């Protein structure tokens, strides 16, 4: 049950130290609420030692909405005193053009995690940006809802299996642990957290990604 720091101390106290492994943390909010910025920040933070809030790991980023920015990871790494090239080498990225491809990527991810095991930098984080984007776009009409819901549910079950088997933290953005983001100082609110206390945290988006 390792924990990855968000880059923000107040957001970390709200999450009980940061996002947990063997779990799926879902951040929901409108465009610009900080979801994608929090994903880019986590992709850097995971690579740090546990004293510095990371897990000496690598990160996987599934991009469904054309939001992944390597130059953003470079900026966050540089402004946090890390080598940007090494950070970029430790983040695996794949763009999903439709729901089917999105699920297919989870089997390819499973394979890379097995390989990452026995290394000094195993994969510890899997990010899925806009988890429902394709499902909503491809399934319009009450008739397609059954397949839409079942396909999403199947994807989430696979994410849980990947998390529980490879001891990885799963982080998903949407327009188990649910966090609502809303609008420089953004606000984060826990949604009926099962073990953590009800509450809110104020955070900023900077050249260091997410921070107090």
């Amino acid at each position: 049950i390792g924990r990855i720091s968000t880059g923000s101390k107040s957001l970390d106290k709200l999450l009980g130290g940061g996002i947990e492994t063997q779990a799926i943390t879902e951040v929901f909010g409108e465009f610009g609420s900080g979801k994608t910025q929090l994903a880019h920040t986590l992709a850097v933070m995971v690579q740090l030692p546990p004293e510095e809030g990371g897990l000496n790991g690598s990160a996987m980023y599934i991009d469904t909405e054309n939001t992944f920015r390597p130059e953003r990871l470079r900026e966050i790494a540089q402004n946090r005193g890390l080598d940007p090239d090494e950070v970029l080498d430790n983040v695996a990225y794949a763009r999903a053009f439709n729901s089917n491809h999105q699920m297919q990527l989870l089997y390819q991810a499973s394979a890379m995690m097995v390989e990452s095991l026995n290394t000094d930098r195993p994969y510890k984080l899997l990010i899925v940006d806009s988890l429902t984007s394709h499902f909503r776009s491809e399934y319009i009409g009450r008739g397609a809802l059954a397949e839409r819901q079942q396909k999403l549910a199947r994807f989430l079950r696979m994410l849980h299996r990947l998390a529980n088997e490879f001891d990885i933290a799963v982080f998903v953005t949407n327009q188990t642990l649910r966090v609502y983001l809303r609008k420089g100082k953004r606000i984060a609110r826990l949604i009926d957290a099962p073990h953590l206390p009800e509450g809110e945290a104020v955070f900023s988006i900077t050249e260091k990604g997410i921070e107090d």
Binding site: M60, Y61, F68, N90, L105, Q108, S110, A111, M112
Partner: peptide
């Protein structure tokens, strides 16, 4: 580009029956 062998992909499908990835650098 991060290649996964057909064999590795088969093991993955087996494990969860009971275009790909690239490093951010562009490999």
């Amino acid at each position: 580009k991060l290649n996964v062998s057909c064999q590795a992909l088969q093991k993955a499908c087996k494990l969860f029956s009971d275009s790909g990835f690239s490093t951010a650098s562009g490999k």
